[PDB]
Structure 1
Amino acid sequence: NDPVAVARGLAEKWRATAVERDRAGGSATAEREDLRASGLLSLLVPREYGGWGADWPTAIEVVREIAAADGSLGHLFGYHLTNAPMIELIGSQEQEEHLYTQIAQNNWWTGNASSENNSHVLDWKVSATPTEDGGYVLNGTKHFCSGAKGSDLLFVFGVVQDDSPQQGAIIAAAIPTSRAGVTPNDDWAAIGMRQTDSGSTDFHNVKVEPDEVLGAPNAFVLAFIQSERGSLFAPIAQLIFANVYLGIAHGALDAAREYTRTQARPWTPAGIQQATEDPYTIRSYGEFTIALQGADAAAREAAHLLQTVWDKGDALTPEDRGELMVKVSGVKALATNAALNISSGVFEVIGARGTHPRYGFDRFWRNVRTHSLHDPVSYKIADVGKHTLNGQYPIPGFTS
């Protein structure tokens, strides 16, 4: 009924273990179970199929709530949300009905071992060999996945690399993570985003049934070229990422605020009497708040635009998609730079004693600093620039 309230409940529960979990790293097994039990995994699945049928702005509010409590869980959950929509972006009506129903009925976690955003297709590690029955066999190791480990349903891409008619095609499929031959490894380590389970997954002679293949061979690339509905992949993922960062930024700001009010001491050599009345501390909080004020407002407008474009279905035009991606690109930039600035900047007001690991105050920065590198913010900014000056739209792809 009120997924945001549910998210708030989880956030409250998770704040108590936030420091220890960041320190420990590894999979957040108990928290993934909390999410499973909450029902939120089917947030975006249509109510027709047992899901919550939430709109994009609402699902984003949930992501933000979770991200503020825990950057890793925010990304884990937010990215999970982007997987199933692929089914209606490039998959068939039959697949939509079947898989949406199973996901909501079974409260499935979804994961991906999908695109290699910065490799030419014939160099991708996971190959797809066509079989006589119209399916494929997957082989190879996807070195960077998102939530494969711990997932029930895995959205995987492979490239046909033999010399058949499908040579070079990206094959998208949704298969059970528990299928023999699929090995999601426990090898994720990073300065931040430590509990996102973003390690490697091995595929050893993994069969993909014809009916598990989403769209035609190379459907995603064909959709990108045409700015068809499948080209909504990037604006959706990018807007979710931007909101994860904004959530992390709010988490950092609120943690700092509580510390300034309760633990911080005034700088007595400056004659300050109360930490909360230091004029530079006051200015810093104003600046943090104002940076988020603009970033959040922009992000909210972008979600409404995404809702509009989404609701057009296959009637969307390349212009609709391009205008959306430009707006989202700007939000990704605003969120990246606000979150980095705030998550680092709050230390100035917290002070020396707050560097103790018991506070884990650097987890916010480490989390944003890590994920913000998924794709280069410099080209987000450039895409916006090319639109402003030249009226040009981003070239659709996995990150633009």
Structure 2
Amino acid sequence: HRALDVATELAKTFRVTVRERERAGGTPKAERDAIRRSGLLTLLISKERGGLGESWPTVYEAIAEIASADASLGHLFGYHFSNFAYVDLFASPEQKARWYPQAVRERWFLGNASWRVTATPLPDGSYEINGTKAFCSGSADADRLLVFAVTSRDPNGDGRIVAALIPSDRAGVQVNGDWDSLGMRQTDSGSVTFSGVVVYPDELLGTPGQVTDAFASGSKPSLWTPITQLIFTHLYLGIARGALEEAAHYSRSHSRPFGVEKATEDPYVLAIYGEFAAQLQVAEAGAREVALRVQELWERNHVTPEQRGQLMVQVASAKIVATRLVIELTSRLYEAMGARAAASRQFGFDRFWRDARTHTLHDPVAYKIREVGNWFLNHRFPTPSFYS
């Protein structure tokens, strides 16, 4: 419970300042540093390597809690664990024995950059990275970037995906700072340009094309996608809960009745809260079960495609329900608050819809629906990829 208490207190502090911060956009350095000081970036690192030795259920609940307060910080925090998951699933034990204590002592907050961007092999096993990555979540103030590139000028085969974990201030890396979005405004998800960037052999995650081989095999590293899509699910549930709580506080404190004596006794106000709160309870309860299954497979040495596909179907279902819920709720709750909630821009409630509306487009929910339908009707698991 201690880690969840730390996340709850962080979220409490973030609520105080989110309204002003997200209007500005840009990098929430102070808040990222507060997360660094909290230790929670080490949740999944073993105690033996200096981390907290915690589980995915705890990580997911902390993501949802932080997201309920500040969706951009929730996303940054959550995608740090997506990046960490990728490293853990592909790095060697020797790499992790060095990286994880270093991540603990240096308080690493991981960012993401990932085809245009090429990896040219050099004779000593190094690579040179060139090109621009269009969207690069958490690419500012990042202690390391998880970078993906495709091999080029490669006598052993072009187009093979390489991944590496590299310093963000390595020569040739330019974080362009061009993120100016509807919502998720403080996730620094703009472009990063690589000009002759060197990647050393001991920074590489697996071999070229290994991620593609793991996807095609449905093996354990292909857990990365359900893990990450469930991170997104918890962002949407967190935003949903935060919006519901903020609306209810407004209804209790500011809404006027319309033969109604109190707005909090209005039958239609109560119906809106009841319908959305009910769907939220069921979605949150279902999501906890899936998070436990993530942890179970995370601990296995081997994962079959049937185990991975069943999990991906469960995650996709959770994401579909959470997507529909957060998008409806963040818009319709105005009907429970009244005109003054929109007449005063400064109240800032539209942040919840803007944040959810932006992030839920990451990959199309229509095709998560098709994937669940193709499984249920035709017994076909989703084809593993970076989105399914």
Question: What residue ranges of structure 1 are gaps of 5+ in the alignment?
Answer: 115-123
1:43 aligned residue: 43
Q: Please list the CA deviations of residues 260-309 of structure 1 after superposition, one character each: whole Å capped at 9, or x if unmatched.
A: 00100001xxx111001100001111001111122112211110111111
Q: Please list the CA deviations of residues 183-216 of structure 1 after superposition, one character each: whole Å capped at 9, or x if unmatched.
A: 1111111100000010111111110001111101
1:370 aligned residue: 358
Matched residue of 1:167: which SS? coil
Contact kept in structure 2, 1:137 and 1:208, CA below 8 Å: yes
1:228 aligned residue: 219
In 1, Cα distance between the equivalents of 2:41 and 2:176? 23
TM-score, L = length of structure 2:
0.98
1:126 aligned residue: 117
2:345 aligned residue: 357
Please report how far the alpha carbon of residue 387 of structure 1 lies from its aligned counterpart in structure 2 after TM superposition.
1.1
Matched residue of 2:346: which SS? coil
In the alignment, is residue 321 of structure 1 matched against residue 292 of structure 2?
no
Contact kept in structure 1, 2:120 and 2:128, CA below 8 Å: yes
Q: Give the partner amino acid of 1:330.
A: S
Matched residue of 1:155: which SS? strand
Q: Please list the CA deviations of residues 11-44 of structure 1 after superposition, one character each: whole Å capped at 9, or x if unmatched.
A: 1111111111122111111111111111111111
2:233 aligned residue: 242
Please report how far the alpha carbon of residue 161 of structure 1 lies from its aligned counterpart in structure 2 after TM superposition.
2.2
In 2, Cα distance between the equivalents of 1:303 and 1:185? 35
Please report how far the alpha carbon of residue 87 of structure 1 lies from its aligned counterpart in structure 2 after TM superposition.
2.1
In 2, Cα distance between the equivalents of 1:163 and 1:322? 33
In 1, Cα distance between the equivalents of 2:29 and 2:90? 31
Range with greater deviation from structure 2 (159-168 or 340-349): 159-168
Q: Please list the CA deviations of residues 155-183 of structure 1 after superposition, one character each: whole Å capped at 9, or x if unmatched.
A: 10111122521311101111111111111
Range with greater deviation from structure 2 (127-136 or 77-86): 77-86
In 2, Cα distance between the equivalents of 1:81 and 1:51? 13
1:276 aligned residue: 264
Contact kept in structure 2, 1:126 and 1:140, CA below 8 Å: yes
1:139 aligned residue: 130
Q: Give the partner amino acid of 2:20.
A: E
Matches of residues 177-196 of structure 1 in structure 2 within 5 Å?
177-196=168-187
Contact kept in structure 2, 1:87 and 1:95, CA below 8 Å: no
Q: Give the partner amino acid of 2:332.
A: G
2:81 aligned residue: 81
Contact kept in structure 1, 2:161 and 2:208, CA below 8 Å: yes
TM-score, L = length of structure 1:
0.95
2:70 aligned residue: 70
Range with greater deviation from structure 2 (189-198 or 33-42): 33-42
Question: What residue ranges of structure 2 are gaps of 5+ in the alignment?
Answer: none
1:204 aligned residue: 195
Identical positions, percent: 51
In 2, Cα distance between the equivalents of 1:297 and 1:179? 43
1:97 aligned residue: 97
Contact kept in structure 1, 2:121 and 2:152, CA below 8 Å: no
Q: Give the partner amino acid of 1:231.
A: S
Pick from 241, 248, 251: which aligns with 1:260? 251
Please report how far the alpha carbon of residue 129 of structure 1 lies from its aligned counterpart in structure 2 after TM superposition.
0.3
Matches of residues 106-125 of structure 1 in structure 2 within 5 Å?
106-114=106-114, 124-125=115-116
2:296 aligned residue: 308
2:167 aligned residue: 176
Q: Please list the CA deviations of residues 325-371 of structure 1 after superposition, one character each: whole Å capped at 9, or x if unmatched.
A: 00000001011011111111111111111111221100001001000
In the alignment, is residue 219 of structure 1 matched against residue 207 of structure 2?
no
In the alignment, is residue 289 of structure 1 matched against residue 277 of structure 2?
yes
RMSD: 1.0
Range with greater deviation from structure 2 (286-295 or 191-200): 286-295
In 2, Cα distance between the equivalents of 1:335 and 1:53? 28
Contact kept in structure 1, 2:121 and 2:154, CA below 8 Å: no
Q: Give the partner amino acid of 1:112.
A: N
In 2, Cα distance between the equivalents of 1:368 and 1:34? 24
Q: Please list the CA deviations of residues 99-136 of structure 1 after superposition, one character each: whole Å capped at 9, or x if unmatched.
A: 1111112111101112xxxxxxxxx1211000010110
Q: Give the partner amino acid of 1:17.
A: T
Contact kept in structure 1, 2:118 and 2:152, CA below 8 Å: yes
In 1, Cα distance between the equivalents of 2:147 and 2:23? 30
In 1, Cα distance between the equivalents of 2:184 and 2:221? 28
Pick from 372, 380, 385: which aligns with 1:384? 372
